[PDB]
Amino acid sequence: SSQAWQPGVAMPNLYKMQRMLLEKCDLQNYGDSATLPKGIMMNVAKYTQLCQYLNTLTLAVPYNMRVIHFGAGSDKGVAPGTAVLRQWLPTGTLLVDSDLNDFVSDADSTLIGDCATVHTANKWDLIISDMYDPKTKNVTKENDSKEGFFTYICGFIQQKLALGGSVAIKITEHSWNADLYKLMGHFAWWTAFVTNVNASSSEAFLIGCNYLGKPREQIDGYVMHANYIFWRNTNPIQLSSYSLFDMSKFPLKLRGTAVMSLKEGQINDMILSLLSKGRLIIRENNRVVISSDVLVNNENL
Amino acid sequence: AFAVDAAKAYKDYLASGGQPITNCVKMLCTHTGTGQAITVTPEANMDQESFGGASCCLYCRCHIDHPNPKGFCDLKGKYVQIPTTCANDPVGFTLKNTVCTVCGMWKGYGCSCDQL
Ligand SMILES: Nc1ncnc2c1ccn2[C@@H]1O[C@H](CO)[C@@H](O)[C@H]1O
Ligand SMILES: [Cl-]
Ligand SMILES: [Cl-]
Ligand SMILES: [Zn+2]
Ligand SMILES: [Zn+2]
């Protein structure tokens, strides 16, 4: 197989190049479950595999790295994904997380509220999102591009992702957005990554690798999602937890990637080539300041 | 003059046969680490499990103030190593036990400072 010993499976380039029409997602392995190591939560396993895959890409890893994690709370009031990210990321990495619902976290700072209330002064080197609304999995109605938090994420990327930075945004059959796929063409490389532990689900992480701030490629996101579902529908993925047992090479290498401030005029093809190779981050190196907008109401009389 | 004593309430709840706090976040790791008690990354050895710190802190989990006068947390943002034999109750373990200020191991579960 080979694939069962990987952390997961990335969408093969040839499927990206198709022009499929959107169909219903019918997974052969739906209902299968991987055998998780004793006492290990799905969320921990899933993030572990995501990070293992991200270790194979050309992520920029500067000193004083800035990472933000949306959708980080669980129904049990803790943040398993944040815990894996902080393990993975170099010690000292600035990690901020957020959720609609209250939770306790190991992040350096946590904001509770709708993601649309979240503002930051600074730019980020890596954006992770597990935001998901299970009310989108309505199989009886048409599956159109969704707005909501995806609209926030697309703006947040274009406004606050450092050039050279990367993203991983959770999608499913029904939880997806066409502009987010289009924005994948603004990175040097992109894919949809399915974890082997959760391969029975139409979930994937849409990964943009090394942001360029402009389209490198024009992607129709309606077509690309249909391509993604076509791939899933015709390529059963064997549930596997095998990669969870070898953590020896898990930590993200602190590459000390260079950070420069630059104005949109000085970004030439040589800068762009460095961005594209994971060798450069462009943003301010100022203090990290965040906030959550709070709506004020007085309900009396 | 009045303060809630959540530490005591949990100790007494446990003694009365209550189910330990659950959903502590256990990490995947090599289990070839230093075995120190509270670390910046998982350091479980072969006899330990490593957990996300916040999820094993009574005060974090109960949404109450930390006994530190500054409210600071020893666990949040770090990883806590729990003997496998006590991993059914990490919160109880961290609350009842103490870290050697010299070697960083749990007194009684790794610390060999008082004669090896
Ligand atoms: N618009 C939003 N802003 C912030 N967090 C959001 C949403 C929508 C969903 N979520 C959070 O995503 C997690 C995964 O379902 C859940 O923890 C859920 O709370
Ligand atoms: Cl449809
Ligand atoms: Cl396309
Ligand atoms: Zn705490
Ligand atoms: Zn000692």
- Say whether residue B11 is in contact with chain A using an 8 A CB cutoff: no
Torsion over CA of A282, A286, A288 and A293, rounded to 10 degrees?
A: -90
User: Is A250 near ligand 1, meaning CB less than 6 Å away?
Assistant: no
Q: Is B86 annotated as a binding residue?
A: no
3-class SS of residue B90: helix
Q: Which of B23, B54, B79 sits opposite A105 (nearest CB)?
A: B54
Partner B contacted by A77 (CB < 8 A) = yes
Contact A106 B42 (CB under 8 A): no
Contact B23 A244 (CB under 8 A): no
Yes or no: say if A204 and A171 are a contact pair by the CB < 8 Å rule.
yes
Cβ atoms of A292 and A68 closer than 8 Å: no
Number of neighbours of residue B57 by Cβ within 10 angstroms: 24
Q: Rounded CA gap, A243 and A240, in Å?
A: 8
- Beta-bridged to residue A195, according to DSSP, are A8
Q: Which two tokens stand for residue A69?
A: 């994690």
CA dist A97 and A71 (Å) reads 8
Which helix or strand (DSSP H or E) is residue B79 part of?
Answer: strand B79-83
How large is the greatest C-alpha to C-alpha distance in chain A, in angstroms? 67
Q: How far is A67 from chain B (nearest CA, A)?
A: 14
| Surrounding residues of ion ligand 5, Cβ less than 5 A | B 100, 102-103, 111, 113
Measure the CA–CA gap between A300 and B112, rounded to whole angstroms: 62
CB of A71 within 6 A of ligand 1: the answer is yes
**CB count, 10 Å around CB of B88?**
14
Residue A38 annotated in active site: no
Chain B contact for A87, CB < 8 A?
A: yes
Active site residue A130: yes
Way the structure was solved: X-ray
> Are the C-beta atoms of B54 and A79 separated by less than 8 Å?
yes
- Token readout for A146 is 């969704």
DSSP collapsed to 3 states, chain A: CCHHHCCEEECCHHHHCCCCCCCCCCCCCCCCCCCCCCCCCHHHHHHHHHHHHHCCCCCCCECCCEEEEECCCCCCCCCHHHHHHHHHCCCCCEEEEEECCCCCCCCCEEEECCHHHEEECCCEEEEEECCCCHHHCCCCCCCCCCCCHHHHHHHHHHHHEEEEEEEEEEECCCCCCHHHHHHHCCEEEEEEEEECCCCCCCCEEEEEEEECCCCCCCCCHHHHHHHHHHHHHHCCCCCCCHHHHCCCCCCCCCCCEEEECCCCCCCCHHHHHHHHCCCEEECCCCCCCEEECCCCCCCCC
The answer, for B86 touching chain A at a CB cutoff of 8 Å, is no
The count of domains in chain A is 1
Whether B28 and A76 lie within 8 Å, measured CB to CB: no
Domain of residue A269: give its range. Answer: 1-301
**Chain A residue at shortest CA distance from B24:** A78
Contact B77 A86 (CB under 8 A): yes
- Tokens encoding A111: 């904001």
Q: Exposed (0-12), middle (13-18) or buried (19+): which is A2, by Cβ within 10 Å? A: exposed
Domain ranges in chain B are: 1-116
Give the separation between CA A211 and CA A190, rounded to whole angstroms: 10
Contacts of A25 (CB under 8 A, 6+ apart): A173, A202, A229, A232, A233
Tokens of B65: 């103030």
CB proximity under 8 Å: B 14-73 to A: 23-30, 40-42, 49, 52-55, 57, 60-61, 63
Pocket test for ligand 1, best of A98, A133, A153, A201 (most atoms within 8 A of CB): A133
Best to test chain A binding among B26, B27, B28 (most A CBs inside 10 Å): B28
Can you name the residues that pair with B38 across neighbouring β-strands? B80
Which residues, 6 or more positions from A271, have their beta carbon under 8 angstroms from its beta carbon?
Answer: A262, A280, A282
Angle, CA of B110, B114 and B116, to the nearest 5°: 60
Q: Nearest by CB to B26, which of A40, A82, A105?
A: A40
Mutate to test the pocket of ligand 1, among A110, A135, A149 (most ligand atoms within 8 A of CB): A149
Taking CB atoms within 8 Å and a gap of at least 24, the contacts of B95-98 are: B95/B7, B95/B10, B95/B11, B95/B58, B96/B11
Alpha helices (H) in B16-70, listed in sequence order: 58-62
Closest by Cα among B50, B49, B67 to B58: B67
Q: Residue A298, CB half-sphere, CA atoms under 13 Å: how many?
A: 2
Under 8 Å between Cβ of A164 and A281? yes
Strand pairing report for A290-292 and A258-260: unpaired
Instruction: Please confirm, yes or no, whether A170 is among the known catalytic residues.
Output: yes
Alpha-helix residue ranges (DSSP H) falling in chain B: 6-15, 58-62, 90-96
Whether A46 sits among the annotated catalytic residues: the reply is yes
Distance (Å) from the alpha carbon of A38 to chain B's nearest alpha carbon: 10
> Maximum CA pair distance of chain B?
47
- Six token digits for residue A43: 């969320």
Residues 6+ apart with CB under 8 A from B103: B36, B110, B111, B112, B113
Residues in A closer than 8 angstroms to B42, CB to CB, are 87
Spatial separation of the C-alpha atoms in residues A199 and A197, rounded to whole Å:
6
Spacing, Cα A31 to ligand 1 middle (Å): 24
d(CA B47, CA B86): 10
Which residues are near ligand 4, the ion (C-beta closer than 5 Å)? B 57, 59-60, 73, 76
